[PDB]
Structures are given as C-alpha cells and as structure tokens.
Amino acid sequence: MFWTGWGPWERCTAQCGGGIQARRRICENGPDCAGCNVEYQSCNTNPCPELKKTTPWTPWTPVNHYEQRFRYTCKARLADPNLLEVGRQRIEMRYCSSDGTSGCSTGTLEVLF
Amino acid sequence: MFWTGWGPWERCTAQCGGGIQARRRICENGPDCAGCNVEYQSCNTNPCPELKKTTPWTPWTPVHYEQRFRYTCKARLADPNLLEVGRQRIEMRYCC
Ligand SMILES: *[C@H]1O[C@H](CO)[C@@H](O)[C@H](O)[C@@H]1O
Numbered sequence: 001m002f003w004t005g006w007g008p009w010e011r012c013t014a015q016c017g018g019g020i021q022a023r024r025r026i027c028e029n030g031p032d033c034a035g036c037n038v039e040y041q042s043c044n045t046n047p048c049p050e051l052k053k054t055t056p057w058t059p060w061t062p063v064n065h066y067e068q069r070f071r072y073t074c075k076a077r078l079a080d081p082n083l084l085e086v087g088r089q090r091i092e093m094r095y096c097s098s099d100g101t102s103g104c105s106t107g108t109l110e111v112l113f
Numbered sequence: 114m115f116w117t118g119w120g121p122w123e124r125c126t127a128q129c130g131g132g133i134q135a136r137r138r139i140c141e142n143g144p145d146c147a148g149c150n151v152e153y154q155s156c157n158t159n160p161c162p163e164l165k166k167t168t169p170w171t172p173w174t175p176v177h178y179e180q181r182f183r184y185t186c187k188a189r190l191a192d193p194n195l196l197e198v199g200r201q202r203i204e205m206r207y208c209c
C-alpha cells in the first residue's frame with residue numbers, strides 16, 4: 001500500500017489573525033499507510049485591519065454668522081466590516097430659563113446687599 | 114511502535130466567534146505508527162459580544178434651550194481595546 005500525493009491546501013479557517021489550512025491524501029490498497037492522511041499549516045497570519053465607519057453628521061447648528069455640524073469615526077480591528085456599526089444618534093437638551101443663560105452659559109447670580 | 118493516548122485539547126485560538134484547538138499524541142518506539150499525531154476541532158463558536166463605546170458629546174448649541182449630540186460605536190469583538198472612537202470632526206460654513 002502507498003500514499004497518494006497531496007491535494008491543494010484548501011480554505012484557511014480565518015481571514016486574518018491566524019487560522020489553519022489542511023491538505024489531504026489517500027492510502028491506496030490499505031487502511032493503514034504510515035503516517036497521516038491529512039497535513040495542516042498556518043495561513044493568513046497577518047493581523048486584522050483597522051476598519052472605519054463615520055457617524056452621520058449631526059444637524060447644522062448656528063455658531064453665534066456661521067453654522068457647524070459634527071461627526072465621529074468608529075474604528076475597530078475586525079476581519080469583516082459588517083461587524084462594525086454606528087448606533088443611533090442621541091440628543092440631550094437643557095432648558096436655559098426665560099433669561100436664556102441660567103443653567104446654560106451662566107450660573108445663578110449673587111447679589112451682595 | 115504504538116501511539117500513546119491522546120493528550121488534552123490545547124487552548125482555543127479564539128475566545129469567541131469560532132477558533133480551533135489541537136490534541137496530540139506520540140508514537141513510541143519509532144516514527145511510523147499508522148495514523149495521525151494531531152487532531153483539530155472547532156471551539157468557542159459562541160458569537161462575539163457586541164461591544165459598545167459612546168462618542169463624546171458635541172458642544173452645547175442653541176435651539177430657551179440648548180442641545181448636544183452623541184452616537185455609539187459598536188463592534189463584534191472579544192476585546193474592548195480593539196474598538197476606538199475617533200477624533201471629533203467639525204464641518205463649518207457661512208449661513209441658517
Ligand atoms: C505514505 O507516507 C509517507 C510518504 O510520504 C511514508 O510514511 C510512506 O510512503 C507512506 O505510504
């Protein structure tokens with residue numbers, strides 16, 4: 001009995017960050033050729049890339065006459081961009097009172113009599 | 114020439130999302146035992162959790178009321194250190 005030659009190296013178990021490959025062979029005319037019908041090796045050992053997605057822009061808002069909006073980037077070290085996602089926009093407001101500044105840009109006034 | 118019993122499965126290559134582990138055994142009294150000295154199986158196929166980090170708040174801006182905004186960044190990862198929020202970007206133009 002005798003081993004056949006190796007076939008191709010087949011699919012790596014990972015896209016990045018290290019996985020394994022296998023190749024196979026057949027023991028002809030017997031169940032028990034010396035050694036193993038399958039051989040393994042390392043593949044795609046490169047570290048996974050930093051993938052990025054930007055948030056949507058916030059709405060335009062006045063500066064004082066200029067307007068501005070904001071965004072951020074979300075970054076992750078991932079094999080697959082579908083595994084990275086931007087969540088919902090969250091809005092916080094605060095009441096500035098009828099004078100338009102107390103609790104916002106100004107604190108409570110103190111008057112010494 | 115005879116194999117020893119299989120050794121225990123080695124540490125999984127991943128904590129989540131599917132990794133691999135190996136078990137081994139030794140052919141005593143010669144090299145040419147029939148069969149294999151290593152086997153692999155899958156391990157930790159539990160999906161990676163969705164890790165979430167909030168962005169900083171934008172500055173307060175007027176709407177009586179002021180408002181600010183944030184988002185969340187989400188990734189399927191084993192390790193929160195691999196998720197990061199980038200720098201705040203401001204776009205500006207004349208107006209309103
Ligand atoms: C197949 O495996 C090796 C050859 O690559 C030897 O142990 C022997 O030839 C066996 O049939």
Ligand SMILES: *[C@H]1O[C@H](CO)[C@@H](O)[C@H](O)[C@@H]1O
Pocket residue numbers: 004005006
């Ligand atoms: C398969 O492995 C190598 C070729 O890649 C050689 O030792 C031989 O061809 C074997 O069957």
Ligand SMILES: *[C@H]1O[C@H](CO)[C@@H](O)[C@H](O)[C@@H]1O
Pocket residue numbers: 114115116146147148
């Ligand atoms: C070890 O592998 C198998 C038993 O697990 C047989 O091919 C033989 O006993 C060998 O020594």
Ligand SMILES: *[C@H]1O[C@H](CO)[C@@H](O)[C@H](O)[C@@H]1O
Pocket residue numbers: 117118119138
């Ligand atoms: C390891 O594999 C199985 C048990 O897991 C048996 O064939 C034998 O115990 C071998 O050493």
